[PDB]
Design an enzyme around this catalytic site. Structure first.
Site, PDB file in Angstrom:
ATOM      1  CG  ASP A   1      -1.927   0.987   1.386  1.00  0.00           C
ATOM      2  OD1 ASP A   1      -1.875   1.999   0.634  1.00  0.00           O
ATOM      3  OD2 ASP A   1      -2.842   0.783   2.223  1.00  0.00           O
TER       4      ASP A   1
ATOM      5  CD  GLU B   1      -3.336   4.921   1.151  1.00  0.00           C
ATOM      6  OE1 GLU B   1      -3.603   3.724   1.291  1.00  0.00           O
ATOM      7  OE2 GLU B   1      -4.108   5.897   1.471  1.00  0.00           O
TER       8      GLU B   1
HETATM    9  C1  LIG Z   1      -6.060  -0.466   2.444  1.00  0.00           C
HETATM   10  C2  LIG Z   1      -6.437   0.909   2.942  1.00  0.00           C
HETATM   11  O1  LIG Z   1      -7.579   1.174   3.325  1.00  0.00           O
HETATM   12  N1  LIG Z   1      -5.445   1.804   3.006  1.00  0.00           N
HETATM   13  C3  LIG Z   1      -5.619   3.166   3.510  1.00  0.00           C
HETATM   14  C4  LIG Z   1      -5.603   3.234   5.044  1.00  0.00           C
HETATM   15  O2  LIG Z   1      -4.278   3.618   5.440  1.00  0.00           O
HETATM   16  C5  LIG Z   1      -6.647   4.159   5.638  1.00  0.00           C
HETATM   17  O3  LIG Z   1      -6.729   3.952   7.056  1.00  0.00           O
HETATM   18  C6  LIG Z   1      -6.712   5.082   7.865  1.00  0.00           C
HETATM   19  O4  LIG Z   1      -5.491   5.784   7.682  1.00  0.00           O
HETATM   20  C7  LIG Z   1      -5.456   7.038   8.390  1.00  0.00           C
HETATM   21  C8  LIG Z   1      -4.115   7.669   8.108  1.00  0.00           C
HETATM   22  O5  LIG Z   1      -3.082   6.857   8.703  1.00  0.00           O
HETATM   23  C9  LIG Z   1      -1.780   7.305   8.445  1.00  0.00           C
HETATM   24  O6  LIG Z   1      -1.524   8.534   9.132  1.00  0.00           O
HETATM   25  C10 LIG Z   1      -1.726   8.466  10.556  1.00  0.00           C
HETATM   26  C11 LIG Z   1      -1.486   9.865  11.093  1.00  0.00           C
HETATM   27  O7  LIG Z   1      -0.117  10.190  10.854  1.00  0.00           O
HETATM   28  C12 LIG Z   1       0.348  11.456  11.276  1.00  0.00           C
HETATM   29  O8  LIG Z   1       0.214  11.658  12.679  1.00  0.00           O
HETATM   30  C13 LIG Z   1       0.965  10.739  13.479  1.00  0.00           C
HETATM   31  C14 LIG Z   1       0.648  11.066  14.917  1.00  0.00           C
HETATM   32  O9  LIG Z   1      -0.722  10.797  15.216  1.00  0.00           O
HETATM   33  C15 LIG Z   1       2.449  10.862  13.158  1.00  0.00           C
HETATM   34  O10 LIG Z   1       3.138   9.869  13.906  1.00  0.00           O
HETATM   35  C16 LIG Z   1       2.693  10.657  11.671  1.00  0.00           C
HETATM   36  O11 LIG Z   1       4.052  10.947  11.354  1.00  0.00           O
HETATM   37  C17 LIG Z   1       1.811  11.579  10.850  1.00  0.00           C
HETATM   38  O12 LIG Z   1       2.283  12.911  11.011  1.00  0.00           O
HETATM   39  C18 LIG Z   1      -0.775   7.429  11.162  1.00  0.00           C
HETATM   40  O13 LIG Z   1      -0.984   7.341  12.565  1.00  0.00           O
HETATM   41  C19 LIG Z   1      -1.005   6.078  10.477  1.00  0.00           C
HETATM   42  O14 LIG Z   1      -0.039   5.139  10.989  1.00  0.00           O
HETATM   43  C20 LIG Z   1      -0.421   4.277  12.040  1.00  0.00           C
HETATM   44  O15 LIG Z   1      -1.302   3.273  11.547  1.00  0.00           O
HETATM   45  C21 LIG Z   1      -0.742   2.405  10.533  1.00  0.00           C
HETATM   46  C22 LIG Z   1      -1.816   1.360  10.248  1.00  0.00           C
HETATM   47  O16 LIG Z   1      -3.033   2.008   9.930  1.00  0.00           O
HETATM   48  C23 LIG Z   1       0.565   1.775  11.005  1.00  0.00           C
HETATM   49  O17 LIG Z   1       1.157   1.085   9.915  1.00  0.00           O
HETATM   50  C24 LIG Z   1       1.536   2.830  11.538  1.00  0.00           C
HETATM   51  O18 LIG Z   1       2.699   2.225  12.071  1.00  0.00           O
HETATM   52  C25 LIG Z   1       0.838   3.654  12.614  1.00  0.00           C
HETATM   53  O19 LIG Z   1       0.465   2.811  13.711  1.00  0.00           O
HETATM   54  C26 LIG Z   1      -0.836   6.231   8.966  1.00  0.00           C
HETATM   55  O20 LIG Z   1       0.498   6.616   8.664  1.00  0.00           O
HETATM   56  C27 LIG Z   1      -5.697   6.824   9.886  1.00  0.00           C
HETATM   57  O21 LIG Z   1      -5.876   8.105  10.520  1.00  0.00           O
HETATM   58  C28 LIG Z   1      -6.969   6.029  10.095  1.00  0.00           C
HETATM   59  O22 LIG Z   1      -7.001   5.791  11.506  1.00  0.00           O
HETATM   60  C29 LIG Z   1      -8.268   5.792  12.081  1.00  0.00           C
HETATM   61  O23 LIG Z   1      -8.993   4.603  11.793  1.00  0.00           O
HETATM   62  C30 LIG Z   1      -8.314   3.411  12.239  1.00  0.00           C
HETATM   63  C31 LIG Z   1      -9.210   2.255  11.831  1.00  0.00           C
HETATM   64  O24 LIG Z   1      -9.294   2.110  10.419  1.00  0.00           O
HETATM   65  C32 LIG Z   1      -8.114   3.486  13.751  1.00  0.00           C
HETATM   66  O25 LIG Z   1      -7.383   2.343  14.199  1.00  0.00           O
HETATM   67  C33 LIG Z   1      -7.388   4.761  14.171  1.00  0.00           C
HETATM   68  O26 LIG Z   1      -7.365   4.858  15.599  1.00  0.00           O
HETATM   69  C34 LIG Z   1      -8.091   5.978  13.578  1.00  0.00           C
HETATM   70  O27 LIG Z   1      -9.363   6.142  14.186  1.00  0.00           O
HETATM   71  C35 LIG Z   1      -6.912   4.712   9.328  1.00  0.00           C
HETATM   72  O28 LIG Z   1      -5.820   3.933   9.828  1.00  0.00           O
HETATM   73  C36 LIG Z   1      -7.970   3.709   5.065  1.00  0.00           C
HETATM   74  C37 LIG Z   1      -9.184   4.419   5.646  1.00  0.00           C
HETATM   75  O29 LIG Z   1      -9.041   5.836   5.421  1.00  0.00           O
HETATM   76  O30 LIG Z   1      -7.940   4.031   3.670  1.00  0.00           O
HETATM   77  C38 LIG Z   1      -6.768   3.944   2.826  1.00  0.00           C
HETATM   78  O31 LIG Z   1      -6.335   5.249   2.605  1.00  0.00           O
HETATM   79 CA   LIG Z   2      -8.321   6.568   3.232  1.00  0.00          CA
END
Ligand SMILES: CC(=O)N[C@@H]1[C@@H](O)[C@H](O[C@@H]2O[C@H](CO[C@H]3O[C@H](CO[C@H]4O[C@H](CO)[C@@H](O)[C@H](O)[C@@H]4O)[C@@H](O)[C@H](O[C@H]4O[C@H](CO)[C@@H](O)[C@H](O)[C@@H]4O)[C@@H]3O)[C@@H](O)[C@H](O[C@H]3O[C@H](CO)[C@@H](O)[C@H](O)[C@@H]3O)[C@@H]2O)[C@@H](CO)O[C@H]1O
Ligand SMILES: [Ca+2]
Ligand SMILES: [Ca+2]
Length: 428
Positions: A264, A266
């Site tokens: 993925d 992203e």
């Molecule tokens: C197949 C698919 O659907 N792919 C994608 C999905 O990625 C997406 O899921 C949602 O993604 C968003 C965005 O996540 C990314 O950004 C997060 C925020 O990053 C920023 O802030 C952080 C501090 O809070 C900083 O550390 C960072 O540098 C940046 O400035 C980031 O936290 C996230 O990374 C975490 O999660 C991934 C796994 O998802 C993991 O690999 C990482 O190691 C880390 O743990 C990503 O980089 C996210 O906000 C959404 O999160 C909500 O929803 C999920 C459930 O789906 C909850 O668990 C979570 O608590 C939030 O409520 C979600 O993960 C989907 C859906 O939009 O769609 C595609 O785009």
């Molecule tokens: Ca998304």
């Protein structure tokens, strides 16, 4: 060249779900044949050492007595289709090991002078055989649609895959993704590395109890890889950087006994173009990584999310995408599309965002539409026990169309990092 006749792949994974598996071995012909065109095939055990060296694999030779060719391996020429073929049967054997991939290297021999074989590669194809007869609980039959599910393992135990069964007892979700490990820059090595957050790392450390029970019942468990806010990314590795990162991904799937990967593209930032492991972000770089990952784990699944620059280039080094993209799943609300010689059997016809609600439902209507369209897969993202009311509502009706058995209401769920099956909904 030589390939499997049913799939048209030069490298074909065979999962045995019963006592026999039948296919053809097909030699492509460069000219319309004549009365003298002829060739045979044989198992080429000596080639397995060469293959294993080239791929850094260790496959054992499938027992030759379990493999039979019709007509002494002589190929029947079809002048109208520029091909010649022979039936091959693979029998399940005794004394084989569960969870081990075996190889049948097949070679052309005794070909007539109208056939030109360019190199040793065009002279061989390979079957990679797995005995799946006992890991049968996700196998819903020949030619049915299959399920592909992402767990947000930050929050949800992937054992919840087991909450989803048809009324006939079969597991709904054929493939599950642990979403997600990350690609990140490793400064001490000056190269990308796999970086696992503590939740991903806990699952891997505890794979015996939290992941292998899924594989025991036939579910394929893939490691998700995702960009993660630095100069590295899945669509911006150079040729050399992709070869190296692919080997690391394959090492994770070997070390933790997993079934492949999802990529993925992203959340990466712009690359440092002065770094030799990186390059301009593009779908050609993404395709390069997919190809190199398949070369490193040819018996495991290489799958992509169609988003960003992860999907779209259909050939790498003259090799078609059918050989190195096993499944492509699309963004919520879209259907995936095939490239190269892929078919829609490699594509999702629906993607359901279970946490936020978009992408539709696996209804009776939608199931039939997807069958009619030739799609192989339906995808779901981020189910959780707290939302099972919504999740299962979106699965009503479709199973009767796809399988002759609807999805059953859930009665068990699992808490994060806990192997205990709890009662749904009473235990929350
Ligand atoms: C197949 C698919 O659907 N792919 C994608 C999905 O990625 C997406 O899921 C949602 O993604 C968003 C965005 O996540 C990314 O950004 C997060 C925020 O990053 C920023 O802030 C952080 C501090 O809070 C900083 O550390 C960072 O540098 C940046 O400035 C980031 O936290 C996230 O990374 C975490 O999660 C991934 C796994 O998802 C993991 O690999 C990482 O190691 C880390 O743990 C990503 O980089 C996210 O906000 C959404 O999160 C909500 O929803 C999920 C459930 O789906 C909850 O668990 C979570 O608590 C939030 O409520 C979600 O993960 C989907 C859906 O939009 O769609 C595609 O785009
Ligand atoms: Ca998304
Ligand atoms: Ca069994």
């Amino acid at each position: 060249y030589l390939r499997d006749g049913k799939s048209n792949l030069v490298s074909k994974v065979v999962e045995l779900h019963g006592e026999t598996y039948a296919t053809t071995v097909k030699m492509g012909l460069s000219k319309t044949p004549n009365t003298a065109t002829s060739a045979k095939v044989k198992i080429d055990a000596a080639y397995l050492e060469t293959y294993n060296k080239a791929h850094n694999t260790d496959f054992a030779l499938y027992p030759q007595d379990l493999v039979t060719f019709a007509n002494e391996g002589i190929l029947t020429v079809n002048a109208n289709t520029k091909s010649a073929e022979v039936e091959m049967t693979i029998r399940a054997g005794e004394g084989l090991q569960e969870d081990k991939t075996y190889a049948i290297p097949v070679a052309i021999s005794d070909q007539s002078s109208d056939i030109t074989i360019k190199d040793e590669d065009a002279k061989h194809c390979i079957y990679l055989v797995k005995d799946m007869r006992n890991a049968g609980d996700a196998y819903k039959g020949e030619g049915v649609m299959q399920g592909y599910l992402f767990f947000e393992v930050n929050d949800v135990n992937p054992l919840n895959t087991l909450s989803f069964q048809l009324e006939n007892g079969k597991l709904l979700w054929d493939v599950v993704v642990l979403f997600a490990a990350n690609i990140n820059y490793d400064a001490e090595a000056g190269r990308p590395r796999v970086q696992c957050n503590p939740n991903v790392q806990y699952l891997l450390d505890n794979n015996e109890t939290l992941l292998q029970p899924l594989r025991r019942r036939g579910v394929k468990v893939l490691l998700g890889l995702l960009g993660n806010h630095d100069i590295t990314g899945l669509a911006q590795l150079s040729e050399q950087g992709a070869k190296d990162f692919a080997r690391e991904v394959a090492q994770y799937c070997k070390a933790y006994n997993l079934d492949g990967v999802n990529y993925d593209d992203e959340y990466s930032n712009s690359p440092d173009l002065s770094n030799p492991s990186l390059t301009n972000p593009s779908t050609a770089a993404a395709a390069r990584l997919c190809y190199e990952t398949k070369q490193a784990m040819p018996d495991k699944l290489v799958t992509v999310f169609d988003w960003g620059q992860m999907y779209g280039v259909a050939t790498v080094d003259g090799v078609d995408a059918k050989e190195w993209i096993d499944i492509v799943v699309a963004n919520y609300g879209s259907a995936a599309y095939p490239i190269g010689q892929m078919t829609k059997k490699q594509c999702s016809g629906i993607s359901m965002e279970f946490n936020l609600g978009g992408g539709g439902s696996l209804s009776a209507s939608k199931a039939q539409s997807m069958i009619d369209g030739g799609y192989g897969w339906f995808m779901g993202f981020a189910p959780s026990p707290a939302k099972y009311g919504s999740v299962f509502s979106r699965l009503q009706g479709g199973g009767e169309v796809l399988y002759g058995s609807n999805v059953a209401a859930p009665t068990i769920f699992y808490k994060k990092n806990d192997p205990t099956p709890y009662k749904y909904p009473d235990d929350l």
